[PDB]
Amino acid sequence: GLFGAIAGFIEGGWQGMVDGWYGYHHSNEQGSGYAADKESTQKAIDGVTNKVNSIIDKMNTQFEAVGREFNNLERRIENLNKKMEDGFLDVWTYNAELLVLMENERTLDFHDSNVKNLYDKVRLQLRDNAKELGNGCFEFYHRCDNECMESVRNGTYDYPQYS
Amino acid sequence: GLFGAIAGFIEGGWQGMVDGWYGYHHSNEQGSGYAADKESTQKAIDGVTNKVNSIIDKMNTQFEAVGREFNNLERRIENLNKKMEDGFLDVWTYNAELLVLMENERTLDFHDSNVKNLYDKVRLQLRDNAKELGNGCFEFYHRCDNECMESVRNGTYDYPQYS
Amino acid sequence: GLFGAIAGFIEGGWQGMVDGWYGYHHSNEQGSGYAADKESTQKAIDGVTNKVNSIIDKMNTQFEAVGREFNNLERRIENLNKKMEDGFLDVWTYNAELLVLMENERTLDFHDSNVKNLYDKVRLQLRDNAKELGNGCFEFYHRCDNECMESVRNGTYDYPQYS
Amino acid sequence: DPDQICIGYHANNSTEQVDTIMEKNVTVTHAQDILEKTHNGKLCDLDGVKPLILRDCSVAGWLLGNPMCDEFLNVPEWSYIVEKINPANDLCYPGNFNDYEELKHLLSRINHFEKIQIIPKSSWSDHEASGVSSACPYQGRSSFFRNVVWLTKKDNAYPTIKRSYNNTNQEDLLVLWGIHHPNDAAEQTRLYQNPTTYISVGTSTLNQRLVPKIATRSKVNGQSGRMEFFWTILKPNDAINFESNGNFIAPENAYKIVKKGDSTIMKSELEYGNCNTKCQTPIGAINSSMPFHNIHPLTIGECPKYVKSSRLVLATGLRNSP
Amino acid sequence: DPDQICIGYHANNSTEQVDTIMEKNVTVTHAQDILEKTHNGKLCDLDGVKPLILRDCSVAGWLLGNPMCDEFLNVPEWSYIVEKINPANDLCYPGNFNDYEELKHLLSRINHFEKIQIIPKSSWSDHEASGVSSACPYQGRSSFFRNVVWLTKKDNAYPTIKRSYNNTNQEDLLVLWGIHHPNDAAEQTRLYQNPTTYISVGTSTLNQRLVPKIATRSKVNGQSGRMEFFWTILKPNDAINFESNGNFIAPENAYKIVKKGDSTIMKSELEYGNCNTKCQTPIGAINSSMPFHNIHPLTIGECPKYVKSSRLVLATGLRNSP
Amino acid sequence: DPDQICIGYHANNSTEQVDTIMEKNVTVTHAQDILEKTHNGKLCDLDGVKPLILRDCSVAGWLLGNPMCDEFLNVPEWSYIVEKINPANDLCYPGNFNDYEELKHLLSRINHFEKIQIIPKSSWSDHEASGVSSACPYQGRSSFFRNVVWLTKKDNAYPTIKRSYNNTNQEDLLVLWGIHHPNDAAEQTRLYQNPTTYISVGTSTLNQRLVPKIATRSKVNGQSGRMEFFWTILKPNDAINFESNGNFIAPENAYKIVKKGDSTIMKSELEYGNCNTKCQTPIGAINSSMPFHNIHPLTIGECPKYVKSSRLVLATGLRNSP
Numbered sequence A, B, C: 001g002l003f004g005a006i007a008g009f010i011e012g013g014w015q016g017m018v019d020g021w022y023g024y025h026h027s028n029e030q031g032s033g034y035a036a037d038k039e040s041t042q043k044a045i046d047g048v049t050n051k052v053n054s055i056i057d058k059m060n061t062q063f064e065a066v067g068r069e070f071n072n073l074e075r076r077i078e079n080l081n082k083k084m085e086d087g088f089l090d091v092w093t094y095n096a097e098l099l100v101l102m103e104n105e106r107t108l109d110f111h112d113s114n115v116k117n118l119y120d121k122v123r124l125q126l127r128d129n130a131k132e133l134g135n136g137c138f139e140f141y142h143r144c145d146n147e148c149m150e151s152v153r154n155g156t157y158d159y160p161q162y163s
Numbered sequence D, E, F: 001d002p003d004q005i006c007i008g009y010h011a012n013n014s015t016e017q018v019d020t021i022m023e024k025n026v027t028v029t030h031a032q033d034i035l036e037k038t039h040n041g042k043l044c045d046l047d048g049v050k051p052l053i054l055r056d057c058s059v060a061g062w063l064l065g066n067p068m069c070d071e072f073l074n075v076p077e078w079s080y081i082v083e084k085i086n087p088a089n090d091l092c093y094p095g096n097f098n099d100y101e102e103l104k105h106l107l108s109r110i111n112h113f114e115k116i117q118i119i120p121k122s123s124w125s126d127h128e129a130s131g132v133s134s135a136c137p138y139q140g141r142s143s144f145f146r147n148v149v150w151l152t153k154k155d156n157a158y159p160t161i162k163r164s165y166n167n168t169n170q171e172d173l174l175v176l177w178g179i180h181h182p183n184d185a186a187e188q189t190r191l192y193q194n195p196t197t198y199i200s201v202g203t204s205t206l207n208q209r210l211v212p213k214i215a216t217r218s219k220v221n222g223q224s225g226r227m228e229f230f231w232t233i234l235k236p237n238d239a240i241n242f243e244s245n246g247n248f249i250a251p252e253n254a255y256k257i258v259k260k261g262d263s264t265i266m267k268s269e270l271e272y273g274n275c276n277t278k279c280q281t282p283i284g285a286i287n288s289s290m291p292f293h294n295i296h297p298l299t300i301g302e303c304p305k306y307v308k309s310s311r312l313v314l315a316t317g318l319r320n321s322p
């Protein structure tokens, strides 16, 4: 979307990552596997859960229509009353439909941002120690075991050790 | 703007690119020329056309004022009626003026995003095969003919062939 | 936030930079020190000041309630009148509370964007002349005196001179 | 051949779609519907309290005591009231109810009446207090409203009436009474000796003096006469004073307002559903944790907010790739 | 001189500006105006149907048949009605129209009347049915409303009137009638023999008994007398019954409501424009594909939505660099 | 060891928090409160103009001249009017004020009256123009409203009244008058010789004929009689015509409307505060440069816009890091 990661330079999503929303796919001599990044996954759950509740709570104090009756010589205020209740219903229907459209868009771009920030978190740790293929992957120059992959996910990758 | 491309590291726009909204300027032994990127140009046309129509369609069910009359001992409800119609007109005027201000901002940043995503689409294809000048251009180490430029625009640039 | 700079790859803010909102921390043989970037700081002040005034000015034409009285056989229109005034007050309260929530979010991401655009303004000037540590800093290969640091802040860093 | 690590994101078998401003039908991994679109089609109890279903009677017919509405002679407390669009049993004897819509507005704030006697038939010594009409049949025999009395002359005489009721109850009291408008001067004297008559009614706030309008009118329920009814709320310790020399449809029963609270008069053709609900509409009840619904704008109870939308769905997950 | 490829974007000679929250007058390559700001300044036909332009007459003056309004004695169907703010020709003979605003609200749902005779002048044998006044001049000679009759005594006698009209048409029927309020008892007997008079009117739903108010009043159109007019809708198969012994301004003509639909009464000083439009306002007509306009809040037809904005412009293109 | 340059941003000791959609209590470096939440608790002058504080009097009691309201016999111009919820001194002699709420709506557009005499007591030659009652005591002795006169019979006679006032002022004129409703026919003849009476009132737009309602009513202020009052605006060069043969509470004083503008009737128990303000509410005055406030929805003056929010705070700075 706006940040170019989801359906961008990362061509598609992973069926195999059932663990969270964003994460890694490693492969080395030991074996390959998926592992969700629990930090940015949890960050997003919180952000999105709050958005949802904020949308529900903002619409609490809303217009509520009421039955009123009028006789056949009160047609002007009958009509006035109708116009006023439709009026408020139409304002609130618009406020709901638009809020959803606007925040849906923000939510999708928010996920796009989180994926891009994760790619850049890895990119800034590796630097010369890995080749940026550009499809979402990094080709290691040195060998990287399961201890070494764990450090990348931790955010504790020692660059001076491997160069 | 937000994404730093338009009026950012790409210093200005191109008068010569009348073909589309974003694109390329090549130069080689054969000859130079402009060519719009038809993918991201078309993507943007669709996105922006939809936005426009969504803004028009959301305001369909809107308040419509009506002539009502009152005699000189119905001043309270005459006044009430007036306050209610001005009321709804003011709410809707605000809803229109604000929607435009908010989406104008998003639209300009959307273009900014598309230009940046195009720069990164090229950058990720070339890598070591070209020098990133930083003004929006890439200086080729190897020679690149009109067949070779076409591949960059296609998204079918073979990196292993030239390194 | 969305752009990954503030509370992202730049781990924290600086107590010592009282000069502006964004800037630099240099260190060389002469001495270290903070200096705000006056261009992007001023750009942000203008943007944010305008936002604030736009929020105030948009809510100018708003609903204003009025005392009306009714006798005990005018309970239907008394009630109607009440529902209509609460109605408009609730619509406007929602319009205020939501505008603030939406623009607060945009403002924080706007700062995040400005910091990231400043990092990229430096990054694109240095290139191979400095090592991108990834925590927000650039390690110089060549020595850089107070004249040389000033050029980076100016936007007048001569890359051909040092490579 | 060399080791590598990739960055990616979730995908799944979801086909749930959402909309944005620039793009429609965007498939996502996770979404949340926030709009309730279904109802049970029934009129239920509102949080354990049964509604008052008037069936074929109107609020007027109920309160005045039309004989067809004998079902509602002493109704228990209610949560809401349900009246049909055009109830069959209204004012059996034709004519209007004065300030009817304002009376109905009062019912919206009332949950229970307690009907009591304020002027017994036995106290009408000098007048015949047993007037009936074939416009109000009860089992073929002519009859009349239960809660008001049609006084007529006795022994070719209609002496001036002077009666007071003092509200010695603690509750507000709904009092109803009426005036009869006859066809011609013949029927006027035949029912009430006096040819020129009046009814005066007075409380601390009311000051009324009604005069009958004798005129020829189109037959309604086989009657060219009309009956116009009135009402008032009599405060505690206040008293109502009636004076009349003819045409007086006097009160027998009044209603103590014993319980006030939220209520409403729904117009509905539906019958009682034998269910319970927290939220009710005129076309059905809603059981839902959704924040919005689109069933009907008029509701009572703990309800979701009503919108005219056909669909409201929030994206919570990522754009889903095929 | 090595080969190179650059990434850029469009620029042009555009000076179109738009606004955002943080920034005003932002020049862009392409923009779209969505606000219509002009109108033709004329009152047109609405989709081929001409409006009813009352010129110097009022709705009252038209319907009662003020002689100055003879232009509108049998008007063809209309799309909307245009009345001036203070029309010269209202009730020529002074006095009020009862429930006038409610009658005008009915006109908003009516597109065509068909005026018919319900009580011919020739049927007034025992009364003079040719009363006129210099307050309603038609060509210098004294005259009166065309659609109602001023009945006065004949042969120093005003026998009680008893007349019925049964609506045997299929359409609803607007009936109008009136009562005359004189200055003093002298003029009362001089016009109608009887000193104490009444008018009773009855339908299936109406039950009226009017009594004239004799009093000295400020001269209006050289008259201290007043005339108060009334109206009703007479349903098909229902009948109206008049009874009076004086002061009765009786009906001659009534109006069949033959076409119902969308309409409105615009207040406007403008005259007929001889144009056609899809959207009309009181100050002019709109021909526009814009979704919004700011011309006037009161419109009829297929119209854009009204806003109070002076400018609404959407950015569609890029920020344009100088 | 080697030289380096870093990019960073501001942080400080701020604990100011703001909210966004996805996140609450977000600490920022700088924020701006835009909601005024306090008031001075006083009723002040509005931009140098003192309000009219009626204290224990009502608008009716003031305008008719209840003797307890002698304080307000000629009040200077005002900015707004402050009336208590249930003022003690209303109509001392019981009864209603006709179209009272519509009169009060007029006061909202009025800043100053100038009271003048239109019918002097000395002009009542044939009637006693000195009627009083113990329901309106002024210092223990019985008295009456100051601005209207209670006319009664003189010498066992009540000849028909016929009086005109022509508004030869340049301003509109508020005229008030009344009718007395007695208990029984005994009191009717004892006060006004005639047993059957009327009051007719006429302007260019008014055509009224009031008849007293004799009936027994609950004692209010020790009185079973009622007085019903009426009002009208008499345009310049128009005249009002009174005719009556009994029960007429005639005008003595009327009010010239000399200043029109913005005003309002606040209901408040508060007393005068001896302050000045630019914005006033019923519970206090606001001095604030904030664009919003949440004090009270009913305000007068140059005021901030009212919202029901408890907190509105805009982020202006960066997210502040610990």
Ligand SMILES: *[C@@H]1O[C@H](CO)[C@@H](O)[C@H](O)[C@H]1NC(C)=O
Binding pocket: D013
């Ligand atoms: C995929 O969807 C199927 C239905 O098509 C569902 O039953 C299954 O649980 C889904 N997979 C999950 C939740 O992992």
Ligand SMILES: *[C@@H]1O[C@H](CO)[C@@H](O)[C@H](O)[C@H]1NC(C)=O
Binding pocket: D024, D025
């Ligand atoms: C998808 O959206 C289109 C309009 O873009 C709509 O017509 C359709 O009903 C939507 N849903 C479907 C096809 O399930």
Ligand SMILES: *[C@@H]1O[C@H](CO)[C@@H](O)[C@H](O)[C@H]1NC(C)=O
Binding pocket: D166, D167, D237, D238, D239, F218, F219
């Ligand atoms: C009703 O009774 C109470 C107390 O018994 C008495 O004080 C009151 O005056 C009576 N009300 C009237 C209107 O006479």
Ligand SMILES: *[C@@H]1O[C@H](CO)[C@@H](O)[C@H](O)[C@H]1NC(C)=O
Binding pocket: E013, E014
């Ligand atoms: C901009 O260029 C167009 C050519 O398409 C021309 O018509 C127009 O006049 C130009 N505007 C100005 C201000 O020169």
Ligand SMILES: *[C@@H]1O[C@H](CO)[C@@H](O)[C@H](O)[C@H]1NC(C)=O
Binding pocket: E024, E025
């Ligand atoms: C541009 O906007 C400014 C205010 O920001 C306004 O005064 C001006 O008239 C606008 N248009 C121009 C300069 O053409």
Ligand SMILES: *[C@@H]1O[C@H](CO)[C@@H](O)[C@H](O)[C@H]1NC(C)=O
Binding pocket: D218, D219, E166, E167, E168, E237, E238, E239
């Ligand atoms: C009017 O005419 C119809 C047709 O004969 C008749 O059936 C009906 O009774 C009449 N209406 C009234 C009110 O008498």
Ligand SMILES: *[C@@H]1O[C@H](CO)[C@@H](O)[C@H](O)[C@H]1NC(C)=O
Binding pocket: F024, F025
């Ligand atoms: C922050 O918000 C919480 C509710 O989430 C509230 O209870 C608390 O008071 C707020 N923090 C303050 C006032 O410092």
Ligand SMILES: *[C@@H]1O[C@H](CO)[C@@H](O)[C@H](O)[C@H]1NC(C)=O
Binding pocket: E218, E219, F166, F167, F168, F237, F238, F239
């Ligand atoms: C009242 O007096 C004015 C002159 O002061 C006169 O022109 C006008 O006609 C009079 N008004 C009436 C209603 O007679």
